């Protein structure tokens, strides 16, 4: 079910010492790769430094991303006008049933999707004027179209397979959460219950509230990452003061054989 996805970003006038362009590469919700226009080199992130990886893998990455850098910084020439720009791209692929890849290639300008890459016609598309401009600049190039094709239909899925084999260790990692449930006097005759999940991987996880064994739904959920690739979650609920000890909190998660009841 997992997927290789690159998060390309360029800006037209960067705060100085900031990079004009940069990429983050992801395997599922793990960041494996990292690149930017200053350093100019694709580097492994996190536990992926220790991946049993082959020679030339990384400089293949670098080579590809440099073509991307050029393309992206080229886009702002095509747009012409003054006002600062932010060009984003989401590129990748996901494995499908029959030893089959499914590609993704969308882009956004100043925070709105506007352009895409049609893998059938081998053309960029989108119909905003901005997208027509950029689409045109790229389509008339040293076979930029072909390289995007190879990158998505060949390189991407070949990489994805390679990482699955050589990086099971990371991908299949499992860490169940530490749980805490607490009561916080809030209002007049009210109080806030907060269930919290600490340090878990993978990030799929649900929090639920019971009140004497019957569902009180969920309230506001919150979800986030820790420094170490693990995750954090919390859910909160309004509740009659003095009626607190009646509630508990239940948690579902891949790293637990069965759902956990969490007392106050």
């Amino acid at each position: 079910h997992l997927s290789l996805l690159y998060h390309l970003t360029a800006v037209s006038s960067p705060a100085p010492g900031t990079p004009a362009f940069w990429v983050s590469g992801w395997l599922g919700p793990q960041q494996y790769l990292s690149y930017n226009s200053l350093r100019g080199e694709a580097e492994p992130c996190g536990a992926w430094v220790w991946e049993n990886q082959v020679s030339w893998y990384w400089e293949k990455e670098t080579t590809d991303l440099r073509i991307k850098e050029k393309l992206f910084l080229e886009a702002f020439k095509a747009l012409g006008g003054k006002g600062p720009y932010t060009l984003q791209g989401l590129l990748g692929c996901e494995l499908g049933p029959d030893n089959t890849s499914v590609p993704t290639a969308k882009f956004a300008l100043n925070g709105e999707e506007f352009m895409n890459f049609d893998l059938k016609q081998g053309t960029w598309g989108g119909d905003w004027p901005e997208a027509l401009a950029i689409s045109q600049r790229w389509q008339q190039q040293d076979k930029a179209a072909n390289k995007e094709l190879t990158f998505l239909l060949f390189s991407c899925p070949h990489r994805l397979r390679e990482h699955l084999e050589r990086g099971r260790g990371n991908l299949e990692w499992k860490e169940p959460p530490s749980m805490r449930l607490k009561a916080r006097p809030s209002s007049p005759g009210f109080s806030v219950l907060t269930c919290s999940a600490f340090s878990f991987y993978p990030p799929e996880l649900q929090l639920r509230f019971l009140r004497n064994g019957l569902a009180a739904g969920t309230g506001q959920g919150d979800f986030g990452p820790n420094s170490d690739g693990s995750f954090h979650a919390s859910s909160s609920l309004t509740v009659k003061s003095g009626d607190e000890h009646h509630y508990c909190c239940i948690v579902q998660h891949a790293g637990l054989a069965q759902p956990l009841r969490v007392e106050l």
Partner: peptide, 25 residues
């Protein structure tokens, strides 16, 4: 950074030949 030396316990399955490549890394 803190994460620079991030290893899951998968390393102790490793042979010697394997674990030497890792030291070299």
């Amino acid at each position: 950074n803190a994460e620079t030396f991030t290893f899951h316990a998968d390393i102790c399955t490793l042979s010697e030949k394997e674990r030497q490549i890792k030291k070299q890394t």
